């Protein structure tokens, strides 16, 4: 029996990546298919990434541990740190519940309030706190960590006395990867990386590069003399051959950035551009920046530098040209609000960073990879 | 549409008011955070709740 990396292996890998984990009870076909190549995949993951993958009877999960965590990676449905704190408290609660045990939502709120380890108390009488817990519960239910049929927490939104009957599912035990030491010894999150890389000392650079490339849409050059980027240059070519054999991607390399493009995204895949209009306006901004390279001098790092004021002028100028075709949502929003949202969005896709203090805008060359415009007949109808 | 525009503008107004109120709340929170930091820190050494 000798399996080979084919369409099926690519599909299993993609399914693993674009989901947090795969549950047997709902994706039995994918689970079996993945299981069939699981042998080749484990070897391959070790060879290229060095990442571990644990496949067991009820689910399969790929510990997509990033080289350096980024904001967009996290559960996006969550909006405050408090949401994560409540999530962790919910986890502790599930640690308190036996498998297939049934508990009421009211009990969960009470124990979470009691246990909550922060100095500043959590109060369930507020609306915002209840919204945070409901979002946490929704994410919990998404992974079937907890099942739910009686009522609907949404009424809990406008009725804190609302009640629902929940059942603790088996998956709660296995949800979180393992932390082999005294977890308290991990006095700070940075110490976790020192673990994952004490486990990846052998050819650490290649595994680092593979993780950085595969996770992020792109990999930005730290500076003119970045050792990592020189490394990338030395094995750009062998990477390209491997990538053509093994995946959907097509490699691109430039002086200050390197990235993977994808040719055919499926339903379940995430890609840029997408439907959200802000990508469109980001592209329009990209074209506008491309059109004045000298005024917005790309610096040696491939970045383009603009101050918040300069950016606001650009956004006004853009609203003048393409604003006619924008959604009424943005057309109706002040310059500064659009500025804040677009800059957060561009951070999520790593196109740029806004220095908090000096307000300098750094636009990465990856932003300059793509530019967009409306069809010409409308551009002339809108603003000729 | 008229009701929608009126409620949207009113909602935007309340958005401003809420933002300023949350600003004030976080200002007070910063003061309180500094005070709690100092109090627990300076009373840290003592074997006292």
């Amino acid at each position: 029996q000798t399996q080979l990396f084919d369409e099926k292996a690519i599909q299993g890998m993609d399914i693993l990546f674009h989901h947090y984990w795969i549950l047997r009870a709902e994706q039995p076909e994918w689970y079996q298919l993945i299981r069939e190549r699981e042998k080749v995949l484990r070897r391959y993951l070790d060879e290229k990434f060095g990442l571990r993958l644990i496949v067991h009877q009820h689910f399969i999960k790929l510990e997509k541990i990033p080289v350096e965590p980024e904001g967009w990676m996290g559960i996006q449905d969550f909006q405050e740190p408090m949401d994560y704190a409540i999530f962790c408290c919910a986890l502790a609660f599930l640690e308190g519940k036996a498998v297939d045990e049934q508990f009421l939502l009211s009990e969960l709120c009470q124990e979470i309030q009691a246990d909550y380890p922060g100095d500043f108390p959590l109060d369930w009488t507020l609306y915002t706190h209840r919204k945070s817990l409901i979002r946490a519960v929704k994410v919990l239910m998404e992974f079937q960590l907890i099942r739910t049929i009686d009522g609907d927490i949404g009424r809990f939104d406008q009725n804190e006395e609302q009640e629902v009957l929940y059942e603790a599912s088996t998956y709660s035990r296995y949800f979180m990867r393992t932390y082999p030491d005294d977890f308290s010894s991990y006095q700070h999150w940075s110490e976790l990386l020192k673990e994952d890389w004490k486990l990846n000392q052998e050819d650490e650079r290649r595994k680092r590069v593979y993780r950085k490339l595969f996770f992020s849409p792109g990999l930005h050059r730290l500076d003119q003399q970045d050792p990592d980027f020189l490394y990338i240059r030395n094995y750009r070519n062998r990477l390209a051959e491997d990538i053509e054999k093994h995946s959907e991607y097509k490699l691109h390399v430039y002086k200050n950035t390197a990235f993977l493009s994808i040719a055919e995204p499926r339903q379940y895949q995430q890609v840029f551009p997408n439907s959200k209009a802000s990508t469109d306006i980001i592209l329009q901004l990209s074209k506008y920046i491309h059109g004045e390279p000298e005024r917005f001098k790309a610096n040696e790092n491939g970045e383009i530098l603009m101050t918040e004021g300069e950016f606001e002028q650009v956004v006004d100028d853009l609203r003048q040209q393409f604003g006619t075709g924008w959604a009424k949502y943005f057309r109706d929003m002040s310059t500064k609000g659009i500025r804040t949202e677009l800059l957060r969005a561009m951070k999520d896709w790593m196109m740029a960073e806004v220095d908090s203090e000096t307000s300098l805008i750094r636009i990465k060359s990856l932003t300059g990879v793509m530019t967009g415009e409306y069809p010409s007949d409308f551009q002339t109808g809108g603003t000729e | 549409n008229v009701q929608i525009e009126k409620t949207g503008h009113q909602l935007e107004e309340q958005k401003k008011v809420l933002f300023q109120l949350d600003e004030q709340w976080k200002q007070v929170h910063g003061h309180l955070q500094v005070i709690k930091i100092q109090l627990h820190q300076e009373g840290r050494q003592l074997n006292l709740s």
Binding site: - | L21, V28, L32
Partner: protein, 49 residues
């Protein structure tokens, strides 16, 4: 004594801060209720069109 002074300041700020937190949450409730109401009404308006 100094820590007691800090304690009085913290308690004062804690009650004011709780007041502000409840006020801000109430305004958030108001804003979100209006926003949900406006969005359902807006879909209703598209449907009606």
């Amino acid at each position: 004594a100094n820590l007691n002074q800090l304690a009085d300041e913290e308690n004062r700020l804690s009650e004011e801060h709780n007041r502000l937190q409840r006020q801000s949450s109430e305004k958030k409730k108001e804003v979100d209720a209006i926003r949900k109401n406006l969005d359902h009404l807006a879909d209703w308006f598209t449907e009606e069109k």
